[PDB]
Design a protein around this ligand. Structure first.
Ligand SMILES: Cc1ccc(CNC[C@H](C)O)s1
Length: 186
């Protein structure tokens, strides 16, 4: 099936806990995969203006590890619940992708999760201004604008609203699309 095929592809790129003990400032993100109308989509947030990190930017749900978290996957799930109301029984964490090194002292660990079909986002307005889906296939033929810095523009055909996706967020979206969608019969 579509969902079983995605999980089998994803598992081949799982690095697991290999880099998780290194002595960095630690953050985790959840890359949430949602199936709608027979296709896979990724879920994104727009951060609220009043945050420290990335005010007003398009990002995946996530945040800083705290002492309560059993592991890096726990960080991602805790933060996703706080930001958009995703509960743990509504997510299957499938793998841990290559981590992102930034600022010389920080490591960001990305996890891919499959999201239950009955989940409906409840945006927490203290953290998130908006929550939206993009079809995964978009990232194979994106609409690119150069600011050189490459920026993707996505317009939701439901409402005509345009979103700008860039940086590590855009890079991770492309990676997930390549993993799941490359070399597929039609
Ligand atoms: C927890 C976070 C660390 C940095 C962030 C900014 N958005 C980038 C993310 C890869 O979508 S959020």
């Amino acid at each position: 099936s579509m969902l079983d095929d995605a999980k089998a592809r994803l598992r081949k790129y799982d690095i697991g806990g290999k880099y998780s003990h290194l002595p960095y400032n630690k953050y985790s993100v959840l890359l949430p995969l949602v199936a709608k109308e027979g296709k896979l989509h990724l879920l994104f947030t727009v951060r609220s203006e009043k945050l420290r990190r990335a005010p007003g930017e398009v990002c995946f749900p996530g945040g800083k590890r705290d002492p309560t978290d059993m592991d890096d996957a726990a960080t991602a799930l805790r933060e996703a619940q706080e930001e958009v109301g995703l509960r743990p029984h509504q997510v299957e964490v499938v793998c841990c992708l290559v981590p992102c090194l930034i600022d010389t002292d920080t490591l960001i660990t990305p996890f891919v999760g499959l999201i239950d079909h009955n989940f409906q986002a409840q945006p927490n307005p203290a953290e998130v201004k908006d929550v939206f889906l993009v079809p995964l296939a978009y990232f194979l033929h994106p609409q690119v604008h150069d600011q050189i810095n490459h920026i993707f523009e996505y317009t939701n055909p439901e409402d005509g609203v345009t979103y700008q996706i860039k940086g590590m967020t855009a890079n991770l979206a492309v990676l997930v699309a390549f993993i799941i969608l490359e070399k597929k019969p039609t």
